[PDB]
Amino acid sequence: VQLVESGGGLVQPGGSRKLSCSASGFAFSSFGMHWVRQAPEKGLEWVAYISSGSGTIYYADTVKGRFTISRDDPKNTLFLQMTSLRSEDTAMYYCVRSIYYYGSSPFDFWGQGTTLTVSAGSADIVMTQATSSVPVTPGESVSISCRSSKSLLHSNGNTYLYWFLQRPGQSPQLLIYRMSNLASGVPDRFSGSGSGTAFTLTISRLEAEDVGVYYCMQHLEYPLTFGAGTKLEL
Amino acid sequence: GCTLSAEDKAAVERSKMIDRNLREDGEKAAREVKLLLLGAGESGKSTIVKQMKITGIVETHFTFKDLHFKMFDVGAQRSERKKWIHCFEGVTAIIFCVALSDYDLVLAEDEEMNRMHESMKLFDSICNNKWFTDTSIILFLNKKDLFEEKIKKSPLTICYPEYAGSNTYEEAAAYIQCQFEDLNKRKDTKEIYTHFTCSTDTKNVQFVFDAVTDVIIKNNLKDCGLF
Amino acid sequence: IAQARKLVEQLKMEANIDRIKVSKAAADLMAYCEAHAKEDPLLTPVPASENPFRE
Amino acid sequence: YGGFLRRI
Amino acid sequence: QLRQEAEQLKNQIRDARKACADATLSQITNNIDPVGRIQMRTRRTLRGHLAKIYAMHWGTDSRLLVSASQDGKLIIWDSYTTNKVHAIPLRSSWVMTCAYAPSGNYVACGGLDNICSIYNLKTREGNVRVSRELAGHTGYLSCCRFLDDNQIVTSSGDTTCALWDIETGQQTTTFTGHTGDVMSLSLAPDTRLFVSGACDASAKLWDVREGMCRQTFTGHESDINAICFFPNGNAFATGSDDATCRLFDLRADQELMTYSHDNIICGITSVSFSKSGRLLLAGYDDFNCNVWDALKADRAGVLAGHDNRVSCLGVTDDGMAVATGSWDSFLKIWN
Amino acid sequence: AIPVIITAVYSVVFVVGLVGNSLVMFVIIRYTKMKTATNIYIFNLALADALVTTTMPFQSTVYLMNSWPFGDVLCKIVISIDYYNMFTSIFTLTMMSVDRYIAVCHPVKALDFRTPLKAKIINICIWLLSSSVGISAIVLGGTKVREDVDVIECSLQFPDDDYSWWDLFMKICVFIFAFVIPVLIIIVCYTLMILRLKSVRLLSGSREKDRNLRRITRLVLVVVAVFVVCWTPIHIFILVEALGSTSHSTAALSSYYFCIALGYTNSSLNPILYAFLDENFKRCFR
Ligand SMILES: CC(C)CCC[C@@H](C)[C@H]1CC[C@H]2[C@@H]3CC=C4C[C@@H](O)CC[C@]4(C)[C@H]3CC[C@]12C
Ligand SMILES: CC(C)CCC[C@@H](C)[C@H]1CC[C@H]2[C@@H]3CC=C4C[C@@H](O)CC[C@]4(C)[C@H]3CC[C@]12C
Ligand SMILES: CC(C)CCC[C@@H](C)[C@H]1CC[C@H]2[C@@H]3CC=C4C[C@@H](O)CC[C@]4(C)[C@H]3CC[C@]12C
Ligand SMILES: CCCCCCCCCCCCCCCC(=O)O
Ligand SMILES: CCCCCCCCCCCCCCCC(=O)O
């Protein structure tokens, strides 16, 4: 299972550039694909999403019209045609897989990341974290809270809050999906809870590997707005 | 609609793509002809499989004259036939193969039972079944060369006392043919397709193709409602 | 010969067993139905607020 | 059909 | 020689069976009220099968279920929102049974190919692939049930049963003693015992840990097609081709009550219980199911709506809904 | 005495056809789901005959009153529906004949031809092919008043410089396309169908099956006899009056509208000939 994307580099201001992600080691034809961008000093940001079979396509409100997503299932390759990119689009781009069924764990695997360097919204649910830096020590229990602009609880019973850990110099990974279920490969140290308005993430018997930046995510409605990111330090 | 959440819409889209792949596979599963290959190993059946080609069911896929045949060999079963014969209700045709030259050979068991009479009671138990009332049966009388070389030595009267004809080949073969065709109680909707094995390229396959052609014509007349 | 000895041994293993009367069996059969009668949605119809199989 | 024609 | 000794042992066993029957279940259960007319309505109707449904099994979370058709398809149904979760293609289309794991990870399937296929659902690759194949039976595989993640009991047409080991690929226990084709299999709720019904009109109680039979029940006049434990783990109901159901008890070692009606001449395909064990649902060959009172033998309900023979019948774990699968290629959910 | 019996025959044919087409349409709508191609064809045929039977009282009014006292919109719509759905009915009958011909003579292609999707595509093509004449009837159909006779007529207006020529041309085009091609196709298809069925071992296997084959043959002969006996006289009569000779006799007027009544009588008999004689529609009805 690997997602390796390429095509970035120095771009003339006002030009165009096409990215391509080679997917190998998994069933590409049954996964919906996402694109996540990251500023060099700010948090992550969703770009676009194509579904399985190119049926349903969602764009973000700030990239609509400029960008174009496309996929090719026999070649197992996801493309990203960018046109008339401005000075804001210089960022680190990630490719995400996601499957959606009862019991699925979307946003599980993340791309290695490619760079892009150019020569330089009231209806959305705003996710806001209460802190930005928490000094921690190895061996204690650390809890980090969050705040949402809208109740993420749905009438079927689910709550669309996902947690992510981005270690420094590495790609982010999934920790807790639906606020009550652990992802595969995640130890029992991480635990999540919420009330539909205020959410908590607790870590018992924390280790030195668990240092990084914690991102939250709502998935109740498109576009996907991401958290500011809580960075831990030793 | 707008009531569904962001993940449930993608789940519905996945379900619709699954149902599209299911109907695209169901059309190909419905556009092919299934053939239930009955008979016994002592009669000679694997040689007919080898002629038509050139651990409970042997599935043989072959295409002749742009028609796809799936032949199911169920000879490896060692249980009661009743509890799995109801699975083959939707089969197009039975291919039932018995040997002529086993007319005088005794069975492997200690009891003095003829293999020809065991084949006739097996054909009577299969042909008079409630699941196969509208299913055609293609009968293959095998080992004609050995039967021809053997009937010159032993008479046919040792099998059953009903035969009163001469010891020649063609009259005795036609009388065995009509004795197999007399076992059909349901002579209205069922027809028996008796054919001596030719042991020649594109003869038995041609006969089975013509038989399946007649059954597809009867099924199309039932689908039109003209029949 | 060998099968009959196995059948005799199986009937000897079956005969050396402890059995109870049918009255205590009937009482313990009715007690499970009478004790868990409130937890059976098939026995008594559940209202639609708690039913997950809504129309 | 027939009725809707010029017949004298 | 020892046939007379075996006959004397059978004499002693049925004399003990006569001595243990000092009363009647119909007489003692007179003090309970009748259930009345059970009216159940179709909540969901599952569509997308183009073949004859032969088996189903509910999930452990009372929401998902599995379905086995004869076009070579195992379909995992989301029973609340009618969605298709997985569509597993089968290497052999002739499949007579299917099971679902108590952990939700694996799916078993078997049939006339004499191979018990174990499929893994939670793969990292994203598709359901073949994980194990148990090719150890010489007769048709009629039923299979999951004791655990790494254990499975299978019943086959070679008059034997088997306790397997999934991660190795070989059977750990071979259960011999049946003289007929074992058609149905039901595990106990504590997963310590099981009982198997065969075509010799007898049901045998087996032991998982020891590996040998303990009790043998007679009384049927034809082949046994269905079996299911009462939810306490002490009694079980059997369905035959004699249009009768029978309630056997393990401690009393005799039958308790016969479920029959005069105009019904058709056999039983699948029996099941509710969560409380008061209602016994049995699908027949007259295109219908019937909800019998399991303590009064009264025909309390009729489930009609299928166009062909109802093959499989399942009741979920919490007792909410009842899934009925028939040969008309529709799974109907009743509540 | 003659106009009363003629309008009574028209009334009988109208009521019988409307009740027939309505019962068949209702059964296809609710009793039997449209999963086969045959029921789709019967559905489109019943719809075409139900829209053709609607025109009949207006023709009765034109015959008896000798005047059209309605508006021009009603004239245009009734003409367009009558022509449009008459061609739709005839082409539906011809495609059903071709479908059963392919079903019997080419059984391997029947698997690749008897799809419900393909049947729907073919039926949309038949309705579109009729739509050309439908749009031509909407554009050319209209009402004109005749001063010397002091009566108003509803008809297909053509320019009067070459009215007799373009009218004769249209009558030859309509007669050839709606009669010569469907009749020859139905004769060739059913003749080759019966010749193919005579070479079937199953049909000649037993006396009872031979009886069933005889019944199928009788059914084919009945359907073709009804189609020929009903369409041939009015087509020949219109052609003879169009070119051979022009006249205007009372008895000739009665025979003219009697042949028109026979042409609509075929459409009124089509539900009984096609739905109430199929062995599958009986088992759906029972
Ligand atoms: C005035 C007399 C002849 C009665 C006419 C009834 C007509 C107008 C009505 C009654 C039944 C209706 C049909 C009902 C069902 C369908 C199937 C749908 O997919 C297309 C429309 C269609 C085909 C309707 C067309 C109009 C219809 C045919
Ligand atoms: C009633 C009128 C309009 C149509 C009559 C059609 C029927 C009765 C006629 C017209 C053409 C005729 C066919 C012409 C040619 C042949 C080939 C010959 O080797 C067998 C008879 C056969 C098959 C005839 C059978 C009868 C037939 C089909
Ligand atoms: C089954 C098919 C062949 C029947 C065809 C019947 C045809 C041939 C008959 C029926 C009606 C007949 C017409 C009736 C009236 C007239 C008016 C008369 O002044 C000239 C002959 C003429 C024009 C007849 C010609 C022949 C005719 C058209
Ligand atoms: C004249 C009236 C009837 C007209 C009927 C027209 C039927 C047209 C059918 C076209 C089928 C085309 C199939 C193409 C298949 C392919 O090449 O992929
Ligand atoms: C002589 C040519 C014209 C014949 C017109 C016949 C009009 C009535 C047709 C009735 C057909 C009845 C078919 C019954 C078939 C059956 O049930 O056996």
**Which domains can be identified in chain A, with CATH numbers?**
2-118 (2.60.40.10), 127-232 (2.60.40.10)
User: Which residues on C lie below 8 Å from E278 (Cβ)?
Assistant: 33, 37, 40, 43
Residue E1 near chain C (CB below 8 Å)? yes
Name the 3-class secondary structure at F149. coil
Residue E114 and residue E134: Cα distance in Å, rounded?
Answer: 8
Residue E54 and residue E101: Cα distance in Å, rounded?
Answer: 18
CA A86 / ligand 3 centre spacing (Å): 85
Strands A77-83 and A92-98: unpaired
* Whole-angstrom Cα Rg for chain F: 21
Which residues, judged by CB distance below 6 Å to any ligand atom, belong to the binding site of ligand 2? F 191, 195, 224-225, 228
What is the identity of the amino acid at A176? I
Closest partner CB to A1 (pick from E63, E85, E124): E124
Name the 3-class secondary structure at B218. helix
Name the 3-class secondary structure at A1. coil
* Strand order from edge to edge, sheet including E83-89: E55-58, E64-69, E73-78, E83-89
Residue of chain B with shortest Cα separation from E50: B26
CA F112 / ligand 4 centre spacing (Å): 12
Residue A36 and residue A92: Cα distance in Å, rounded?
Answer: 8
Could you give the dihedral angle defined by the CA atoms of residues F239, F241, F242 and F247, in that order, rounded to the nearest 10 degrees?
A: 180
Q: Which residues contact F232 (CB under 8 A, 6 or more apart)?
A: none
Strands (E), E112-202: 116-120, 129-134, 141-146, 152-156, 160-164, 171-176, 182-187, 193-198
> Is the distance from CB of A38 to CB of A111 less than 8 angstroms?
no
Ligand that comes closest to the CA of residue F55 = 1
∠B134-B139-B140 over CA atoms, to 5°? 155
- State the DSSP H helix or E strand holding residue F19, giving kind and residue range, or none if neither: helix F2-26
∠E215-E221-E224 over CA atoms, to 5°? 60
Interface size A-E, in CB pairs within 8 Å, comes to: 27
Residue F270 and residue A134: Cα distance in Å, rounded?
Answer: 86
Of F97, F101, F185, F187, the residue with max ligand 2 atoms within 8 A of its CB, to mutate for a pocket test, comes to F187
Residue B214 and residue B219: Cα distance in Å, rounded?
Answer: 9
Nearest in space to E108 (alpha carbons), one of E168, E138, E156, E152: E152
Resolution (A): 3.2
CB atoms < 10 A from the CB of B22, how many? 20
B32-224: which CATH topology?
Rossmann fold (3.40.50)
Nearest CA residue ID for atom 2, ligand 2: F225
Chain A touching partners, 3 or more CB pairs below 8 A? B, E
Residue B31 and residue E170: Cα distance in Å, rounded?
Answer: 39
Nearest CA residue ID for atom 20, ligand 2: F195
Closest partner CB to F208 (pick from B66, B67, B188): B188
Which numbered atom of ligand 3 lies nearest the CA of F240?
A: 23
- DSSP 8-state class, residue A109: -
Residue F155 near chain D (CB below 8 Å)? yes
CB atoms < 10 A from the CB of F177, how many? 14
How far is the alpha carbon of D7 from chain F, nearest alpha carbon, in Å? 8
> Is the distance from CB of E244 to CB of E255 less than 8 angstroms?
no
User: Which residues on E lie below 8 Å from A103 (Cβ)?
Assistant: 64, 85, 104
Q: Which residues contact C2 (CB under 8 A, 6 or more apart)?
A: none
Do A and B make contact via 3 or more CB pairs under 8 A? The reply is: yes
Per-position DSSP letters for E2-35, written without gaps between them: -HHHHHHHHHHHHHHHHHT-SS-HHHHGGGSPP-
Under an 8 A CB cutoff, do E124 and A27 touch? Answer: no
Could you give the dihedral angle defined by the CA atoms of residues F127, F133, F135 and F136, in that order, rounded to the nearest 10 degrees?
A: 180
Nearest in space to E157 (alpha carbons), one of E137, E136, E139: E139
Do D and C make contact via 3 or more CB pairs under 8 A? The reply is: no
- DSSP 8-state class, residue C45: P
Name the 3-class secondary structure at F241. helix
> Is the distance from CB of F15 to CB of F267 less than 8 angstroms?
no
Nearest in space to A105 (alpha carbons), one of A163, A183, A35: A183
Distance between alpha carbon F125 and the CA centroid of its chain, in Å? 17
CA F100 / ligand 4 centre spacing (Å): 16
> Is the distance from CB of A175 to CB of A110 less than 8 angstroms?
no
Residue E244 and residue E241: Cα distance in Å, rounded?
Answer: 7
Cβ(F179) – ligand 3 distance below 6 Å:
no
- State the DSSP H helix or E strand holding residue C32, giving kind and residue range, or none if neither: helix C22-35
Name the 3-class secondary structure at F26. helix
How far is the alpha carbon of F40 from chain D, nearest alpha carbon, in Å? 26
Under an 8 A CB cutoff, do E85 and A27 touch? Answer: no
User: Which residues on F lie below 8 Å from D6 (Cβ)?
Assistant: 153, 155, 167
What is the token pair recorded at E37? Answer: 């007319």
Do C and E make contact via 3 or more CB pairs under 8 A? The reply is: yes
What residue has token string 């509710």?
E274
Q: How far is CA F150 from CA E75, F58, F63, in A?
A: 76, 20, 16
> Is the distance from CB of A23 to CB of A6 less than 8 angstroms?
no
Residue A109 and residue B111: Cα distance in Å, rounded?
Answer: 70
> Is the distance from CB of B37 to CB of B71 less than 8 angstroms?
yes
Per-position DSSP letters for F188-209, written without gaps between them: HHHHHHHHHHHT-TTTTTSHHH
> Is the distance from CB of A35 to CB of A48 less than 8 angstroms?
yes
The strand pairing partners of E239, in sequence order, are E226, E245
What is the token pair recorded at F264? Answer: 């609509």
Under an 8 A CB cutoff, do E139 and B79 touch? Answer: yes
Interface size A-B, in CB pairs within 8 Å, comes to: 37
What is the token pair recorded at E137? Answer: 């039976």
Residue A103 and residue E104: Cα distance in Å, rounded?
Answer: 10
Q: Residue A223, preceding bond cis, omega within 30 degrees?
A: yes
C27 half-sphere exposure, CB direction, 13 A CA radius: 6
Cβ(F252) – ligand 3 distance below 6 Å:
yes
> Is the distance from CB of F237 to CB of F259 less than 8 angstroms?
yes
Residue F41 and residue F28: Cα distance in Å, rounded?
Answer: 11
Q: Write down the domain spans for chain E.
A: 2-334
> Is the distance from CB of B188 to CB of B133 less than 8 angstroms?
no
Q: How many domains does chain F have?
A: 1
Per-position DSSP letters for E72-127, written without gaps between them: TEEEEEETTTTEEEEEEE-S-S-EEEEEE-SSSSEEEEEETT--EEEEESS-SSSS
> Is the distance from CB of B195 to CB of B207 less than 8 angstroms?
yes
Q: Which residues contact B6 (CB under 8 A, 6 or more apart)?
A: A160, A219, A220, A221, A222
Q: What are the backbone angles phi and psi of residue E123, rounded to the nearest 5°?
A: -70, 150
Q: For the range E32-37, what are the long-range contacts, defined as Cβ-Cβ under 8 Å and sequence gap of 24 or more?
A: E32/C30, E32/C34, E32/E295, E32/E296, E34/E293, E34/E296, E34/E298, E34/E300, E35/C43, E35/E278, E35/E279, E35/E293, E35/E296, E35/E298, E35/E300, E36/E300, E37/E300, E37/E301
> Is the distance from CB of E277 to CB of C33 less than 8 angstroms?
yes
Which numbered atom of ligand 1 lies nearest the CA of F51?
A: 3
- State the DSSP H helix or E strand holding residue A114, giving kind and residue range, or none if neither: strand A114-115
Ligand that comes closest to the CA of residue F192 = 2
Helix, strand, coil percentages (3-state) for chain D, rounded to 5, are 0, 0, 100
A8 half-sphere exposure, CB direction, 13 A CA radius: 18
Closest partner CB to F82 (pick from D1, D7, D8): D1
Name the 3-class secondary structure at F248. coil
CA F220 / ligand 5 centre spacing (Å): 10
- DSSP 8-state class, residue A89: G
- DSSP 8-state class, residue A226: B
What is the token pair recorded at B105? Answer: 């050979």
Could you give the dihedral angle defined by the CA atoms of residues B17, B22, B25 and B30, in that order, rounded to the nearest 10 degrees?
A: -140
Residue E165 Ramachandran class (φ > 0 left, ψ -120 to 50 alpha, else beta):
beta
Burial of F147 (0-12, 13-18, 19+ CB in 10 A): exposed
CATH code for the part of the protein at E2-334: 2.130.10.10
- DSSP 8-state class, residue E295: T
Q: Which residues contact B62 (CB under 8 A, 6 or more apart)?
A: B52, B53, B68, B69, B71
Element counts in chain C: helices (H) and strands (E): 2, 0
Full residue range of the structural domain in which residue F5 is found: 1-286
What is the token pair recorded at E99? Answer: 């099971």
Crossing angle of helices F207-239/F163-175, nearest 10°? 180
Which numbered atom of ligand 1 lies nearest the CA of F47?
A: 28
What is the identity of the amino acid at A183? A
